[PDB]
């Protein structure tokens, strides 16, 4: 019933990098405009914008609405944001699909956006501090990256998974270098061009056009990777090199019914066949994609062997490894263009980011059946199955 | 099709009052346990928790999940939060309904939660401040209450509406006093007892049980109301007395199919027959409820005259007056137990809070057809139609 | 040769009390006017104002200039502040004396002022905080009360003195009670009436005359004293009850040669016959007064027995007892009207504050030779000998 | 009878440059050790260290005693800071001279130190902030650079003087260019080598040695000067180019009796023949050096024409010209190696910084009489006369 008419994403910016001072909703507005243009659909026609966003503090009322309004979506339309952590960008898409499935809207723009760079530090001060030092809390770390039940970083959950799965530092680094090497090759061959829409960072002393993923290392070496220190555990195995990055970006999709696309003469990027979300132990959250992907497949009536292409989000080499090992899908069809270790990981946006990557590679290679999945802090996974028209 | 098996709310707390240092997820956890207990449904049976929440900064990863885990919802379930401003707690319920209608879940807990007291001040400090003072932003004011497009308070949107609809200060005050007087009578008669679940405020030198709405003023006088100064515009008409408050609380509902409740022998509080959300001009966001309620009724196939009871959220006397004038429903059936001017207005929670009040009043008086609606910052409304079974 | 024509001091306020919102320089201005008025000297005759002050953060350029100008001292005069911690208030008078003695000035106003209540929290943010929590530092504690070499509170240095002089908890409670009793006694006997000059705390909702030492607790008994738990060590001896308080206040003296006073027909509160500052171990900083006292005494060619009146700052019961035991002077002429434990310890002003008490008490009882001394954090002491004329 | 036995200063750092993260007392300790070494005096011989410093917030108890201790001065000695704003560094030396003059001390180290980089932002937060944004105040701007009575920047007092004296933009620019060219020439020709002691910036990623003033622009031209826009007044004359800079550094002098130096075989840098400080209207604070220099010269018995060399702090091209214009001393003997416009102006150290430049230049050219002077925010001036031996 529901198709993805069009998709777009910004380049992913490095932490305090190209988009260091760019509010998330500015990134979202550009991707909203882009999917409308790519589909031949006027902003006037949008019913609702649904944007995942984990870190909106200090951005002002409902950044999803600010994005939609900046893109010229009409005031009569609606907008909201949601948060299921790193599952957000993809969940928003399944949520958008449900609005159409129940007959409550016809045209939805859904995805995610995140500025981890603009995330502020904070403190509750209404009571006052009579005496003594107090903490200014980094919201990115606190609200984005720390498990609320165990008090440790997502990177520690990665350690937990490495131990349970017995994944050596050497195995994790090999994975990491492959991801970098795949992404470099894809960037250089122009495989990210179709999906990226440029973003203009307005500057008094010059406007800069950002249209490439700046986090991707060129010529990353295993030796330099092997050299790194463990980032979360002195005798750990997870490093800055084999973990995903802290990043900025947005990414979205334009949804409507298959019949509606047909009337408009649009050739959709894909049909949404199923999605699923399941929970797992917070301590091993990186394992979420396993039950999530298996449920999505079952809902699709598909076998793992039926898939032609897969984007499994690389939160950490440790967890991506475990996911691939348990699901057992051919690794040669997974993250064919590199993943988050190389490309970066703007949390609320990431699920829509890999959806864009999946859809455009499926189109270019003629892949019929695909799946995107991500792990979720606090212990969850989300997955979505996509079939080509 | 989808019914509300059961519902519950905490007392609504005064700003920096009874829940001054209570994080929202703790209020949510209590309300999740209550809906479960009231339906006879075990926590193990819940598929997903969905909580509207506008101000989660500093609380940690995905407070919805924290609330759910604290209530004993199993790790295999999921949880997410969402943000459609004051519409959130009600939109969360419509979203929960869609999970079931599309066959993606069987049992949902849905509502909202908010601690405006615990909302922090923040600043973006990653780039440093080379020189010059800078602002520590109040997230409640900034992210909750300020219009992102015009830069003025929701109270200014209320002024715009009062000007446009030509509602005197005296008229707004009379509405305000009536709200207070209806709320006091309802409290004293015990009409809020069904819907409220007590919350134990843990204290080092004494736990305190909060089970009454503390913001409700006893013996409110028109003369005291009339002596207040305009709170947003020196020659304005909107005052602290005829505006909603800044408050804390949570409220939820347990959702399942009609056939599911029947299998379980559950007598539902009601059937969700339609909902709607529509946009309007940010400048007069308080008019949100007009097109939303009309759309909801049309979808329900109901005339305005078909309604037996209505809860229209009182963000400001000014806009609540405008809403009633335009829709023309019998004002004697609207907020019969008072509303937000008296009871309070914890943003994320408010939509579920008025849903609770509607359901328990509908049950108590044998009302067949109900509607709940709220205005939303940035120019939106949401409304839901409920029929008794 | 150099005399103190006149002296005055504010009442000493409790922490976040009478002066919770009053900037030190306002308190300075009141005291400057009082010494002029009391000596019958025009402000235009002041060459320079010198004010000790440890916690100026946030008050604007050179608070001593601000105080001087508010007090009426014309623009032609000069002003500056100085910091020798708790010695400041007294040191400033020594410095003032030195201006005249070298023939560089004729008339000085010198003393100290401090608002520990108005001391702000701070952080260095120019380079930015890239990631992670940081601390907002209480300047009162950091710059005021923490030893910069060992990193602990002045309370620990007193604990240090407690264990070296083997002073028992009860032996410090005894000292604490007797100070309180004496303080209450002088107060009710009206012995602080002369030195004190009232301060008017302006206000929107009222004006308040502050003319009483509010930190003095009346009816002090040993019972409550010995029921306090240690303040700096889980099983130490120093407590809130036997250490000085946190307080606001200002105090000052008017200086000029003995000839000048004569020409103006002024009867001086006394003559400064010597002064001294010496250093000691930072760990046992409370001992400071021992060497500075002997130095000043030796410089004046007096013996300890020559003294008729002594003011020895009560930073802590521990250090005060230690100094009194080491010096061997008669415990019945020391802090006759009680000390800082009962009166308050406004760091920057304390040395001038105790100088006032000394001066007015000497005059009242007909004492000939007098001494004021204070210990200083970082390991220093300062002392001054005063003779009646 | 007081002589400057020796002197030293760090290189002056650019704002957030070489010493971006270097606490003032560290620079202070280096300069203290240096003057000890240069004079051949043992640290254990130092009675007191006196350091001017305007922005100490968050550096802990009495940064001056920190410097003295780190520098190796024994706990037995004393130390304190003082604030006469821009004149602090030179006033310190005059105060140390008085210590010896009155026989209270034999050997003093006096000067000043400032880290405008490390100055923090602050907020008074003890009462708490119930709601609303609040200001985090830049202490550098607030306590250092803003007139407490008029609320505007020193740059505005500068305009006042410029308009008062009718000094054209071009004129101020011509002065700016000279000061840079003079400093560049002095730097390259080795003229700063004597006075500067190198400072080692300790660093994880390596140590860096700083021994050159990094703020001096090489090849400054009238062309570049002209292109700059007004820094404070939209139709003003003062720009970043003809105004002094924000900077870090420290400077000091070892003081002793002339007979003591002769006992030691020391050939002092000069004899302090007089000093003076005077007030003026804060609005035109930049005029301060006029009365100060004239009073100093009068106290010295010197005609203006007796001077062989002059250091007159270049707070602004505006006030500098004015001062020079009034006094009428030969311009070719004024700031011969450049001034603060090029070298930098580390507030509390500045007066000791220009004292170093003067002393060392007086020696290499055989100058007999010299004068140093600076303006002071809040409307004061200070000056000192030096005579070679
Ligand atoms: C004047 C002042 C406000 C400007 O501060 P600032 O703008 O942060 O410093 P900058 O040098 O970066 O000024 C901006 C620009 O002018 C420049 N500039 C300054 N002098 C220049 C020159 N002689 N030639 C060419 N460019 C010059 C640039 O370096 C610069 O360009 P950029 O912004 O692209 O980097 C500041 O230095 C100050 O307040 N000075 C006075 C301090 C004081 O009052 N002390 C006490 C007085 S008694
Ligand atoms: C000692 C010190 C740490 C305590 O400050 P504080 O504990 O925050 O002050 P409080 O308002 O909390 O009062 C302290 C507590 O003991 C009490 N108390 C203190 N003296 C008491 C007495 N004489 N009798 C009965 N109770 C007493 C209580 O009032 C109690 O608070 P409560 O109401 O919760 O029971 C503080 O005053 C200080 O730092 N003193 C030293 C200052 C200094 O070092 N200056 C320079 C010296 S070199
Ligand atoms: C309206 C608002 C600004 C007022 O906040 P506030 O004035 O700071 O809070 P208060 O309740 O303490 O009001 C202050 C005063 O009016 C009084 N007051 C309020 N209602 C009164 C009444 N019905 N009768 C008599 N006095 C009343 C107080 O008791 C009080 O007296 P005081 O100043 O001597 O203490 C604030 O509640 C607000 O922002 N509400 C709107 C929130 C909103 O927009 N939500 C979403 C909309 S889509
Ligand atoms: C792991 C993490 C803490 C590190 O961030 P960071 O400390 O800023 O690391 P950086 O990118 O600045 O790089 C650090 C060092 O290793 C680097 N490095 C990183 N990858 C490298 C590589 N592949 N090869 C060589 N060096 C590499 C260096 O550039 C650097 O050295 P230097 O800066 O001292 O000169 C951070 O990226 C993070 O938290 N990632 C996980 C986020 C996450 O949990 N998201 C969601 C999961 S559900
Ligand atoms: Cl979101
Ligand atoms: K959000
Ligand atoms: Na010093």
From Swiss-Prot, chains A, B, C, D:
PROSITE patterns: THIOLASE_1 (PS00098), THIOLASE_2 (PS00737), THIOLASE_3 (PS00099). Its main location: cytoplasm. Gene3D superfamilies: 3.40.47.10. One of its GO terms (biological process) is poly-hydroxybutyrate biosynthetic process. Keywords: Acyltransferase, Cytoplasm, PHB biosynthesis, Transferase. GO terms for molecular function: acetyl-CoA C-acetyltransferase activity. It catalyses: 2 acetyl-CoA = acetoacetyl-CoA + CoA. It comes from the Bacteria. Pathway: Biopolymer metabolism; poly-(R)-3-hydroxybutanoate biosynthesis; Metabolic intermediate biosynthesis; (R)-mevalonate biosynthesis; (R)-mevalonate from acetyl-CoA: step 1/3. It holds the Pfam family Thiolase_C. It is found in: Cytoplasm. The keyword Cytoplasm applies. It is an enzyme of class 2 (transferase). Belongs to the thiolase-like superfamily. Thiolase family. This is Acetyl-CoA acetyltransferase.
């Amino acid at each position: 019933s529901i198709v993805i008419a069009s998709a777009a994403r910004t380049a992913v910016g490095s932490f305090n990098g190209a988009f260091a001072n760019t509010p998330a909703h500015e990134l979202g507005a550009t991707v909203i405009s882009a999917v409308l243009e790519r589909a031949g659909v006027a902003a006037g026609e949008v019913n609702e914008v649904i944007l995942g966003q984990v870190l909106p503090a200090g951005e002002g009322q409902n950044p999803a609405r600010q994005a939609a309004m900046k893109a010229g979506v009409p005031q009569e339309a609606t907008a909201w944001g949601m948060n299921q952590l790193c599952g957000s960008g993809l969940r928003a898409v399944a949520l958008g699909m449900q609005q159409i499935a129940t007959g409550d809207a016809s045209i939805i723009v859904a995805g995610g956006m995140e500025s981890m760079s603009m995330a502020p530090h904070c403190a509750h001060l209404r009571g006052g501090v009579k005496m003594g030092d107090f903490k200014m809390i980094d919201t990115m770390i606190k609200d984005g990256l720390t498990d609320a039940f165990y008090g440790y970083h997502m990177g520690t959950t990665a350690e937990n998974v490495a131990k349970q799965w017995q994944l050596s530092r050497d195995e994790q680094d090999a994975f990491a270098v492959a991801s970098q090497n795949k992404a470099e090759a894809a960037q250089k061959d122009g495989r990210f061009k179709d999906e990226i829409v440029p973003f203009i960072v307005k500057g008094r002393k010059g406007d800069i056009t950002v249209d490439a993923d700046e986090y991707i290392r060129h010529g990353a070496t295993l030796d330099s990777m092997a050299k790194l220190r463990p980032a979360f555990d002195k005798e750990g195995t997870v490093t800055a090199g084999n973990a995903s990055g802290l990043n900025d970006g947005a990414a979205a999709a334009l949804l409507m019914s298959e019949a509606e696309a047909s009337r408009r003469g649009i050739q959709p990027l894909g049909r949404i066949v199923s999605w699923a979300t399941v929970g797992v132990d917070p301590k091993v959250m990186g394992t979420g994609p396993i039950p999530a992907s298996r449920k999505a497949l079952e809902r699709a009536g598909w076998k793992i062997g039926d898939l032609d292409l897969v984007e499994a989000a690389e939160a950490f080499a440790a967890q991506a490894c475990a996911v691939n090992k348990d699901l057992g899908w051919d690794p040669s069809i997974v993250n064919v263009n590199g993943g988050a270790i190389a490309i970066g990981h703007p949390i609320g946006a990431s699920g829509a980011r890999i959806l864009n990557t999946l859809l455009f590679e499926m189109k270019r290679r003629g892949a019929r059946k695909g799946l995107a999945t991500l792990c979720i802090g606090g212990g969850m996974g989300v997955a979505m199955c996509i079939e080509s028209l």
